[PDB]
C-alpha cells in the first residue's frame, strides 16, 4: 500500500494567477482534490468523507498555501532559466510513502519536475537532494538553509504512515480487497487468411495486471497488441491484449491473465 | 515628494505585519502605494488629514515572499512625485547565522571591532543591522564548510542575516542579538 500526492501548478501569464491542482491517492483510489480555480479541499472517496470538518479546513488551508508557494516558485524558476514573462510553465511534485507487509514505512519519496523535466528529488535517506541541473542547485541550497529535508523526513516517516494506515482501516472493505478481472475473448476476421483474438480484462482493482498470449504455450510477446490499462470510471480498470493469428489456427492460442486478486491465473480460449 | 516610512521597520518577519506610513505636507486626498519586485502591486488609500499633514497607513498583511520588495508612495489630489524607494524585506525563511566579534564584544573606545557573520548554509550575501544598510558578500566554502563575511566596524545590539543573490529581499532568520559594548 501507498499514499501519493500529485501537485500541478501552471502559470497563466496574463490570464490570472497560476492554476494549482492537487490530487491524493491511496494505491489506485483517489480520495482528495483541490483546484485553485471558492477553492476547497474536497473528498473523492467515501472513507475520507468520514473525517471531520476540522480535518478539511486544515487541509484546505495547506492547499491554498501550497498554491501561494508554487506561485512564487514558478516566479523563481522562470528567473533561474532566464525565461520570459509571456510563456506558460509547469511545476509538478509527486511525494508520499510506501508501506511494507508490516504496515510500516518501506520508502518515502518527493520528486519535482519543471516543464516535464526532472528537477529536484529527495534522496532515499530523506536527508539530501539530487539537483537535476544548475538551476535546481539554487533550490537545493535554499531548501538546505530552510532545513526542509527534516520537515519532509518527519512527514514521510510519521504522519504519512499514520494517515495511510488510518485511511486503509477506514476503507478496508474497498482498499484492502483486490477485485479480480472479468475476462472474455472476442474474435474478428482480418483480411482473407487471418483473424484477431482479443483478450479482455474488466472490473479489476488494483490496476496492476498482466495479460499474455500463448501459442501452444509459447509467449507471443512480439506480435501482441497491448493497450494501456485504462480507468473504467467506477473505480475499476480495463485492459485488453490482441493477437493476429492465421484463420483456422485459433485453437492453439490461449490468453493468460495474472492479477494479485486471483488464486490461480486465468487461462482463456476462443472456441467457435 | 511624500514620505514613506515602515513601522516598526522595513525588516518584516515572515507571517507578521508591518505598516507603511505615507505622509506629506501637501494636501493629497488619496495615496498610492506601489511595490516593485517579484510580484508587483498598487494599493489605494483615502488619506487622513490632520494639522496640514496628509497621511495614509498601508497595512502590509501577514508577511509573505510576494509582499517583499521596493515600495514607493504617491499622493494625488484627484499623481505626485514618487516617494524615495523603501525596500521591505522578509526575514525568517532560512536557518539563522552566527554573529561574532573580533576582538570581543566588549572593547574600549578606539579599538577597531569587526563582526563575522557565518553559517554552514551557502548564503551568497550577509546583512548587518543594528536598522540595516551593511551588505557584504560571503566567502566560502571554508574547510569547515562555512560561508562567512566580515563587517569592519558607539555600541549597540547587532544582528546579521544571510540571503541569496537571486532574491535580494528574502533573508534568513535573524542571528542571535550580539551586543557591542564600547566602554
Amino acid at each position: 500500500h501507498s499514499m501519493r500526492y500529485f501537485y500541478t501548478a501552471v502559470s497563466r501569464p496574463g490570464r490570472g494567477e497560476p492554476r494549482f491542482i492537487a490530487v491524493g491517492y491511496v494505491d489506485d483510489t483517489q480520495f482528495v482534490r483541490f483546484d485553485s480555480d471558492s477553492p476547497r479541499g474536497e473528498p473523492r472517496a467515501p472513507w475520507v468523507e468520514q473525517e471531520g470538518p476540522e480535518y478539511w479546513d486544515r487541509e484546505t488551508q495547506k492547499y491554498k498555501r501550497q498554491a501561494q508557494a508554487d506561485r512564487v516558485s514558478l516566479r523563481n524558476l522562470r528567473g533561474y532559466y532566464n525565461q520570459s514573462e509571456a510563456g506558460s510553465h509547469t511545476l509538478q511534485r509527486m511525494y508520499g510513502c510506501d508501506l511494507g507487509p508490516d504496515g510500516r514505512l518501506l520508502r518515502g519519496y518527493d520528486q519535482s519536475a519543471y516543464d516535464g523535466k526532472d528537477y529536484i528529488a529527495l534522496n532515499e535517506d530523506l536527508r539530501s537532494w539530487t539537483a537535476a541541473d544548475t538551476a535546481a542547485q539554487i533550490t537545493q541550497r535554499k531548501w538546505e538553509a530552510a532545513r526542509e529535508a527534516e520537515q519532509w523526513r518527519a512527514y514521510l516517516e510519521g504522519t504519512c504512515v499514520e494517515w495511510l494506515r488510518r485511511y486503509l482501516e477506514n476503507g478496508k472493505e474497498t482498499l484492502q480487497r483486490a477485485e479480480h478481472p472479468k475476462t472474455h475473448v472476442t474474435h474478428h476476421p482480418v483480411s482473407d487468411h487471418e483473424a484477431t483474438l482479443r483478450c479482455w480484462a474488466l472490473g479489476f482493482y488494483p490496476a496492476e495486471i498482466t495479460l499474455t498470449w500463448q501459442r501452444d504455450g509459447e509467449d507471443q510477446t512480439q506480435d501482441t497488441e497491448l493497450v494501456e490499462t485504462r480507468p473504467a470510471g467506477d473505480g475499476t480498470f480495463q485492459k485488453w491484449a490482441a493477437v493476429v493469428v492465421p484463420s483456422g489456427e485459433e485453437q492453439r492460442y490461449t490468453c493468460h491473465v495474472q492479477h494479485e486478486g486471483l488464486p490461480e491465473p486465468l487461462t482463456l480460449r476462443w472456441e467457435p | 515628494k511624500p514620505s514613506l516610512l515602515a513601522h516598526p521597520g522595513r525588516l518584516v518577519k515572515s507571517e507578521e505585519t508591518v505598516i507603511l506610513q505615507c505622509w506629506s505636507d501637501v494636501r493629497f486626498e488619496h495615496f498610492l502605494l506601489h511595490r516593485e519586485g517579484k510580484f508587483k502591486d498598487t494599493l489605494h488609500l483615502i488619506g487622513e488629514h490632520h494639522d496640514g499633514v496628509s497621511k495614509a497607513n498601508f497595512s502590509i498583511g501577514p508577511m509573505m515572499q510576494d509582499l517583499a520588495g521596493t515600495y514607493r508612495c504617491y499622493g494625488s489630489v484627484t499623481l505626485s512625485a514618487p516617494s524615495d524607494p523603501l525596500d521591505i524585506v522578509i526575514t525568517g525563511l532560512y536557518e539563522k547565522p552566527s554573529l561574532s566579534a573580533q576582538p570581543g564584544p566588549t572593547v574600549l573606545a578606539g579599538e577597531s571591532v569587526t563582526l563575522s557573520c557565518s553559517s554552514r548554509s551557502s548564503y551568497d550575501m550577509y546583512h548587518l543591522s543594528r536598522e540595516a544598510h551593511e551588505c557584504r558578500f560571503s566567502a566560502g566554502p571554508k574547510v569547515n564548510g562555512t560561508f562567512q563575511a566580515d563587517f569592519p566596524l558607539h555600541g549597540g545590539t547587532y544582528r546579521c542575516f544571510g540571503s541569496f543573490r537571486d532574491s535580494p529581499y528574502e533573508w534568513s532568520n535573524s542571528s542571535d542579538p550580539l551586543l557591542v559594548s564600547v566602554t
Binding site: 500526492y5 492537487a22 491524493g24 480535518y55 487541509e59 495547506k62 492547499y63 498555501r65 501550497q66 508557494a69 512564487v72 516558485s73 523563481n76 524558476l77 511545476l91 511525494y95 519535482s112 528537477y119 529536484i120 533550490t139 535554499k142 531548501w143 530552510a146 526542509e148 520537515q151 519532509w152 512527514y155 504522519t159 504519512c160 494517515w163 | 515572499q65 525563511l93 532560512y94
Partner: peptide
Amino acid sequence: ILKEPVHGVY
C-alpha cells in the same frame, strides 16, 4: 494528510 507547506519555495 497533506504535507505542511513550510518553506518549500523553489
